[PDB]
Design a protein around this ligand. Structure first.
Ligand SMILES: [Mg+2]
Ligand SMILES: [Mg+2]
Ligand SMILES: [Mg+2]
Ligand SMILES: [Mg+2]
Ligand SMILES: [Mg+2]
Ligand SMILES: [Mg+2]
Ligand SMILES: [Mg+2]
Lengths: 79, 114, 100, 127, 99, 107
RNA sequence: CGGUCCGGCCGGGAACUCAAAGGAGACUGCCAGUGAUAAACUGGAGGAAGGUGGGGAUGACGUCAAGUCAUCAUGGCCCUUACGACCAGGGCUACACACGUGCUACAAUGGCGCAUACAAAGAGAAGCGACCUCGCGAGAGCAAGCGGACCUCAUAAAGUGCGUCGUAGUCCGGAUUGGAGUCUGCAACUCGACUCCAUGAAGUCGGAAUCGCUAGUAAUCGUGGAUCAGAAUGCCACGGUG
């Protein structure tokens, strides 16, 4: 989909990764970046992905690298 | 004539008979015949066994068999076992890449019933 | 449209010539340069900290007289109904009801 | 001595240059068989030269721009008839009888507002 | 050298009046002009809705006709240049000079 | 038609044979305005009828026309073309040639 | 006509096509017949056009308290540290179904491969973007020309010529899905376009019912434009065949 010249990630979420590596794992991190590409430095962390009204925590797995955080949060409730 | 693609191609022209193997369309069948040196309008008649096994080696680079069925399937199993949004689409039989679900979703949903 | 909606459109244009006219124009070129900085240009990351409302994709071409976002024409800069009211009073030069 | 006649169609335009004596046909620096792909288009230009007999009797140097298969062929057929009226001037009684001098002015009808075509209306519901 | 004047306007009966004033002045002062040529009219066509709501089929059919005139002057005579450059022409005529 | 009583148009005849009736025959088979592909099928069908199914090509079509009989000629040509489409042979020139062979021998 | 590097390309030619400013020309004008000697009709000649030539603009008094307080204008009412305003994300694109409106199909009047001929009308400067080079391709790099009858989009498609498939769920039809990518834009997950590989649903001409159309019309083939950063099976135009 996206062009190969640079995988996109937001600047605020990239700062949240850097403090999480140095200071160790924390409580699940609330964010709104559903468009960020998952990098290998995020494996192990729990990122709370906003889906319209709440934040759903997502435990990052090794094979999640390359996907988006929006691909793990359903935005509507179906019955 | 039994290829590594065990399912027997029909006794017709070469570029048509290679299409019956799962994973070889019209374009890839042209690439094998161009790399081997066999004309596309040559039938299974006069296609000698020295000309069939050189087609076995050219198709050997690509995995085109029931082994290709599981590699497409386990790629979907990577989605469904992960718990992603796209993995939820395959489990219920819903369209994935942006097709609407109001009407005209008959391929994904299956036949109609109220 | 509403007065607050037209105030949003003035706010986007005033930032469009401010930020993304010359600064993002350079950042679009350096990310596109194949000759130098093939790996670590980082112009995309500096574009992220810029404000969003300078974008030409976010602005909406609207009628200059009423503010309708529908039926715009770049020839007139107006909505489709307000083109008629200036045409029938002869306010637009050469514009007339045609037959062919 | 040149004898000239203008013939046209919907979007075609053809000139006709007459020179006395040959069976030569040069259309857009090409031959008659080379340019016209349709056999019907080869014969419709032969139709005005039917009552007036041509075998090897007059040159025609023709060019045409615009139109299509029968649009160019209809332009030449109109153009030949005005050249023969220029050539002999007594041939008109046979040419009015054939009807080839009449310019077919049936142009395309305009695409109307509210309809997808000139007369074709979008599909209608009773109630 | 060669100077040319591109004349363009909306009205056809108004563009030829200002065209005739330039050519007659140029012939009077002894200039060499190969007449005015009629360039093809670039006419725009506009179809917009007349209703603000449903009844889609009722529309208006507008046009904008842009006529074109070109006058070519061969010799740059000083009496020709000083007369034509500050003429009093119609307001609806735009001039384009190539020196 | 209630008030407007007018005639019917007279098209130009066949350029190959000079036949007015054969010009109306190619227009029935013609679909999507394809004159060039319609007349090539009709000419190849009649040449199969002429060379291998009886001489006098212009008369051989007439005997096939006579058994299935302005409107009388129009409905006769339409019944040949529409029945030729629903056959088992390979091409349209082969199917319509066998229909004119059957219409000549009234079966 | 001279000049050939075979290109109107360069001297030139102003004829012609085209380009657009003005004008002529069709008015039952003429002839014959019918008709109350009327209006009118029929037939024929002349003519490019003949009986309001072809098409458009042009839609009376009124009818439906038809549609529009969400184009706008506007009487009155209502809220006002909120029925206002800012921002992020989501929704407008959901899914057991129903209805209307379209596209592509179910094919040999076709499919595919190669060769190849003919359009009209528009768009273009924060734009159209050639040539050259690279990639199977979407494109990318380099880089002119052009505010334009000059340059660019832009090689029109059907058709034609040959070869192939031989009546089948097929070399029909392309849905759906996976994998790998292009481009637009802060940013393509929800929800973009396009390309490449692979997969090859239903469908073999469609019930009751129902629609369009009397001629360059129907049918069909492509092209262009508006909207638009990007996003046309819709809509507006334009021609080709007929
Ligand atoms: Mg295959
Ligand atoms: Mg207001
Ligand atoms: Mg927008
Ligand atoms: Mg009312
Ligand atoms: Mg009401
Ligand atoms: Mg297919
Ligand atoms: Mg009618």
């Amino acid at each position: 989909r996206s062009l190969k010249k640079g995988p996109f990630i937001d600047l605020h979420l990239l700062k949240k990764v850097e403090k999480a590596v140095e200071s160790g794992d924390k409580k699940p991190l609330r964010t709104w970046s559903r468009r960020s590409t998952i990098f290998p430095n995020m494996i192990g962390l729990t990122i709370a992905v906003h889906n319209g009204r709440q934040h759903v925590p997502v435990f990052v797995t090794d094979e999640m690298v390359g996907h988006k955080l929006g691909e793990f949060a359903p935005t509507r409730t179906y019955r | 004539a039994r290829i590594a693609g065990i399912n027997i191609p029909d006794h017709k022209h070469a570029v048509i008979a290679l299409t019956s193997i799962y994973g070889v369309g019209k374009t890839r069948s042209k690439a094998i015949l161009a790399a081997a040196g066999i004309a596309e309008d040559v039938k299974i008649s006069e296609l000698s066994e020295g000309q069939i096994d050189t087609l076995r080696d050219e198709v050997a680079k690509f995995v085109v068999e029931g082994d290709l069925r599981r590699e497409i399937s386990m790629s979907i199993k990577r989605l469904m076992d992960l718990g992603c949004y796209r993995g939820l689409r395959h489990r219920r039989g819903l369209p994935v890449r942006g097709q609407r679900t109001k009407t005209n979703a008959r391929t994904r949903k299956g036949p109609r019933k109220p | 449209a509403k007065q607050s909606m037209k105030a949003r459109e003035v706010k986007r244009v005033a930032l469009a010539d401010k930020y993304f006219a010359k600064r993002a124009e350079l950042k679009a070129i350096i990310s596109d340069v194949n000759a130098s900085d093939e790996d670590r240009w980082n112009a995309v990351l500096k574009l992220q900290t810029l404000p969003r409302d300078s974008s030409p994709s976010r602005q909406r071409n609207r009628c200059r007289q009423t503010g309708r976002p529908h039926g715009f024409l770049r020839k007139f800069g107006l909505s489709r109904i307000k083109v008629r009211e200036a045409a029938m009073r002869g306010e637009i030069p050469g514009l007339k009801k045609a037959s062919w | 001595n040149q004898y000239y006649g203008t013939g046209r169609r919907k979007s075609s335009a053809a000139r006709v240059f007459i020179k006395p004596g040959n069976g030569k046909i040069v259309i857009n620096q090409r031959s008659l068989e080379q340019y016209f792909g349709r056999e019907t288009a080869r014969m419709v230009v032969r139709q005005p030269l039917e009552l007036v007999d041509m075998v090897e009797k007059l040159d025609l140097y023709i060019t045409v721009k615009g139109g299509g298969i029968s649009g160019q062929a209809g332009a030449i057929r109109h153009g030949i008839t005005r050249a023969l009226m220029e050539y002999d001037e007594s041939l008109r009684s046979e040419l009015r009888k054939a009807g080839f001098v009449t310019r077919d002015a049936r142009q395309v009808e305009r695409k109307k507002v509210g309809l997808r075509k000139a007369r074709r209306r979008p599909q209608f519901s009773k109630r | 050298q060669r100077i040319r004047i591109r004349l363009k306007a909306f009205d056809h009966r108004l563009i030829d009046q200002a065209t005739a004033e330039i050519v007659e002045t140029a012939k009077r002062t002894g200039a060499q002009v190969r007449g005015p040529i009629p360039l093809p009219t670039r006419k725009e066509r506009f179809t917009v809705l007349i209703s603000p709501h449903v009844n889609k089929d009722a529309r208006d059919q507008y046009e904008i006709r842009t006529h074109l005139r070109l006058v070519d002057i061969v010799e740059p005579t000083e009496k020709t240049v000083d007369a034509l450059m500050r003429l009093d022409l119609a307001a609806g005529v735009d001039v384009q000079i190539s020196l | 038609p209630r008030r407007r009583v007018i005639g019917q148009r007279k098209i130009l005849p066949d350029p190959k044979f000079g036949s007015e009736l054969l010009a109306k025959f190619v227009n029935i088979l013609m679909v999507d305005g394809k004159k060039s592909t319609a007349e090539s099928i009709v000419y190849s069908a009649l040449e199969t009828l002429a060379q291998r199914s009886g001489k006098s090509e212009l008369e051989a079509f007439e005997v096939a026309l006579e058994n299935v009989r302005v409107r009388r000629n129009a409905l006769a040509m339409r019944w040949i073309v529409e029945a030729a489409r629903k056959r088992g042979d390979k091409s349209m020139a082969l199917r319509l040639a066998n229909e004119l062979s059957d219409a000549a021998e009234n079966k």
